[PDB]
Amino acid sequence: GLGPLQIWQTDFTLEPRMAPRSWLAVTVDTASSAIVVTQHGRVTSVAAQHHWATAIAVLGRPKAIKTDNGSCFTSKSTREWLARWGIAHTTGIPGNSQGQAMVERANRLLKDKIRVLAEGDGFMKRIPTSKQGELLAKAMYALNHF
Amino acid sequence: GLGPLQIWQTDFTLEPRMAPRSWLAVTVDTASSAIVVTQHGRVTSVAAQHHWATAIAVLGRPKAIKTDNGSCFTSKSTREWLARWGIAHTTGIPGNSQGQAMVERANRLLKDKIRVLAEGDGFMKRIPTSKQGELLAKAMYALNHF
Numbered sequence A, B: 001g002l003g004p005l006q007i008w009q010t011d012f013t014l015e016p017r018m019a020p021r022s023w024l025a026v027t028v029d030t031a032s033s034a035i036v037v038t039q040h041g042r043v044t045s046v047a048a049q050h051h052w053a054t055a056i057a058v059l060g061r062p063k064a065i066k067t068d069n070g071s072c073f074t075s076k077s078t079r080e081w082l083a084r085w086g087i088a089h090t091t092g093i094p095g096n097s098q099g100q101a102m103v104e105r106a107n108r109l110l111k112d113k114i115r116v117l118a119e120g121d122g123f124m125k126r127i128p129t130s131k132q133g134e135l136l137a138k139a140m141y142a143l144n145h146f
C-alpha cells in the first residue's frame, strides 16, 4: 500500500587491509538503509551467491536486487540461483543515470570505518587475519546501529 | 535478468496557464524516462485513476508506482483501483531521503516547456481553453522525442 519496496543494491569493493579475503561484497537495503557485508577471496558467481544467502538470512527475501553488469552478476549460475529464490534481477536506469549511488556511498563509509577501527587497534597496514572477522562485524554494527 | 524494473513516479503540479484544468498529473517511467501528462480540474482519487488509465494505454502496465502520501493517492478508492490492476503502490525511502526527484525535475521541465511554447504563440498569460490540449501534447512530445 504505502511503504518502500524491498529492493537491494549489491556491489563488490576491494579492501587490501582485509587480505587475503579482501573482496568485500556489500548490500544496501534501499527500504531500510541497512548494510550487510561479507568478505571473499575472489569475485566469482559463487561468492556473490554466498553473500546473498547471508543477506537473506539477515534481512529477509527482497523483491529485486540491482547490480552492475559484472560477470559474477550476469552469469548463468547467478541467473539460476536468483531464479531459484524467486528474486528479480535488475540494473541501472538509462538516460545518463550515473551509478547506483547508495551502495557506492556505503562502500566508502565502510572502508573509512574499517580504517578508523583498525588504526585504533594499532593496525596501520593489513589487519591480522584472526582479527578481521570481528572488526568487519564491528564496522557493520557501527554503520547500522547506534 | 538485466534491465531496469518498470516503476513509475507520479505527482500533481499546479499550472495556472492551463486553467480551468490547471492540475497537471505527471508520470515519469524510471525505466525509460518517458513522461506522460494529463490535465485535470481537481486533484481527486478519480483524477489520479484517469491519469493512470491513460499512462497505462501509452506505456504499458508498470510493476509499481511511487507517489507521496497525498490523499488522492492513499484513499480506499485508489488503493482498490491499483489492486484491481495488480500494480504495487509504494513511497519514498527513509533515511532522510528528500523527495522522488525525477518526477520533480519533470514537473519543472514541463512547466518551462509550456511557458516557452505559449509565449511563442503569443499567450503571455492563460492559454485559451481551445488551444490547451494541443499545446500540452506538443510539450509532452518535446520532452520525450527528438
Ligand SMILES: CC(=O)Nc1cc(S(=O)(=O)O)cc2cc(S(=O)(=O)O)cc(O)c12
Binding pocket: A091, A092, A093, A094, A097, A098, A099, A100, A101, B007, B009, B030, B066, B099, B100, B101, B102, B103
Ligand atoms: C525506483 C526509483 O525511483 N529508483 C530511482 C529513483 C531515483 S530519484 O532521482 O527519483 O530519486 C534515481 C534512481 C537512480 C538509479 S541509478 O541509475 O543511478 O542506479 C536507479 C534508480 O532505481 C533510481
Ligand SMILES: CC(=O)Nc1cc(S(=O)(=O)O)cc2cc(S(=O)(=O)O)cc(O)c12
Binding pocket: A007, A009, A030, A066, A099, A100, A101, A102, A103, B091, B092, B093, B094, B097, B098, B099, B100, B101
Ligand atoms: C530502486 C532504487 O535503487 N531506488 C532508488 C535509488 C537511489 S540511488 O541513490 O541509489 O541512485 C535513490 C533513491 C531515492 C528515492 S527517494 O526517497 O528520493 O524517493 C527512491 C528510490 O527508489 C531511490
